[PDB]
Amino acid sequence: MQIFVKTLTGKTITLEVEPSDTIENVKAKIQDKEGIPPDQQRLIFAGKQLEDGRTLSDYNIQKESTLHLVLRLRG
Amino acid sequence: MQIFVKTLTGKTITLEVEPSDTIENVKAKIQDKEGIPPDQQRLIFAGKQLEDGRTLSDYNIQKESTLHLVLRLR
């Protein structure tokens, strides 16, 4: 399925994910597509900071939902 | 010299740079520190987006200046 990923600047990309992906898998797919380390990715949906071990579908993330990405600057 | 680099939420790093460092060099220094690819970085100084082949001193970025970093999602 396709979701959107959006930063605080409004920049938006599309990302192919599976509903059964863990958040870690989602961050890995962002890293593959964009080169951003997973530990640098804070992903937010509907108020909540998304946790790596949880699954997208369990957060009721939907087809064409948008995750918000914030840069962590962890290094 | 030291400069600061900040995200839109206020996350801050320092970098060791020279006035003659190109913007490409500085992005590569950020990649070294943070793992972020240079072509994924946009750096801004006091409203002005910094261009890869120019140097810090071109923008009158002196010691202890702050730059802001955003992702390009390129």
UniProtKB/Swiss-Prot annotation, chain B:
It is found in: Cytoplasm; Nucleus; Mitochondrion outer membrane. Phosphorylated ubiquitin specifically binds and activates parkin (PRKN), triggering mitophagy. Phosphorylation does not affect E1-mediated E2 charging of ubiquitin but affects discharging of E2 enzymes to form polyubiquitin chains. It also affects deubiquitination by deubiquitinase enzymes such as USP30. It comes from the Eukaryota. Residues 1-74 form the Ubiquitin-like domain. The modification Phosphoserine is found at S65. Transmembrane segments: none annotated. It is a peripheral membrane protein. Exists either covalently attached to another protein, or free (unanchored). When covalently bound, it is conjugated to target proteins via an isopeptide bond either as a monomer (monoubiquitin), a polymer linked via different Lys residues of the ubiquitin (polyubiquitin chains) or a linear polymer linked via the initiator Met of the ubiquitin (linear polyubiquitin chains). This is Ubiquitin. The chain holds residues 77 to 150 of 690 of the full protein.
